[PDB]
């Protein structure tokens, strides 16, 4: 069937970006980590602009808009990676020009983290995650981000409600053969949160170690 929110979210789905790693620079771990951060950093611009295309999001105060993005950003980054990686096996498509297999994760000291993301990938593969579900969940992730600093709680709750309702309809319409599918989707969010935290903490340590340069936006989101 048709759902209005799902259709908007599909259309707001932004374009590919690329890691553009230096082929001159030798394959070490700081190369890997720097690329991922530059990417993440540019990927955050996209996310910021993508948020605005979420029905209701711009209706919130600018403060709430920040708070949600400050809680959820890494979940959205990871969801991006996860989705891109669904057609692959045991590899993570950080970008089209940057795909990490197990060995490449080790080299960069990201095995544990990337395994957890892979776990996420494998779950959505086992569920046959559709684009429509993915964009809705990504939006829900943003809206259900549990910031401590929300001014207008009822508006954010409304936004959660709206996004939630759309998932209900989409699954009601497209997946009547599984009247729980929506809830199964929502039940993947804990592991998303967990993996997001694991990642935030790992890269925060790297910031502190001072060896990996990081562009401003990335740092600003990291220190929040």
């Amino acid at each position: 069937p048709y759902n209005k929110i799902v259709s908007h979210l599909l259309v707001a789905e932004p374009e590919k970006i690329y890691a553009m790693p230096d082929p001159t620079v030798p394959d070490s771990d700081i190369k890997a980590l720097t690329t991922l951060c530059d990417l993440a950093d540019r990927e955050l611009v996209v996310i910021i602009g993508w948020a605005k295309h979420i029905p209701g999001f711009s209706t919130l105060s600018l403060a709430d808009q920040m708070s949600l993005l400050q809680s959820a950003w890494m979940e959205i980054l990871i969801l991006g990676v996860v989705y891109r990686s669904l057609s692959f096996e045991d590899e993570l498509v950080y970008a089209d020009d940057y795909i990490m297999d197990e060995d490449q994760s080790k080299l960069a000291g990201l095995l544990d983290l990337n395994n957890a993301i892979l776990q996420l990938v494998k779950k959505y593969k086992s569920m046959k995650l559709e684009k429509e579900e993915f964009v809705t969940l990504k939006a829900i992730a943003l809206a259900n981000s549990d910031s401590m600093h929300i001014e207008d709680v009822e508006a954010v709750q409304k936004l959660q409600d709206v996004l939630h309702e759309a998932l209900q309809d989409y699954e009601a319409g497209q997946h009547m053969e599984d009247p729980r599918r929506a809830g199964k989707m929502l039940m993947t969010l804990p592991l998303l949160r967990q993996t997001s935290t694991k990642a935030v903490q790992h890269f925060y340590n790297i910031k502190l170690e001072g060896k990996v340069p990081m562009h401003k936006l990335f740092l600003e989101m990291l220190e929040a």
Partner: peptide, 13 residues
């Protein structure tokens, strides 16, 4: 601030 600027700035894809 940078987050804020970008929210306030326009999306140019």
């Amino acid at each position: 601030s940078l987050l804020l600027h970008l929210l306030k700035s326009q999306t140019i894809p």
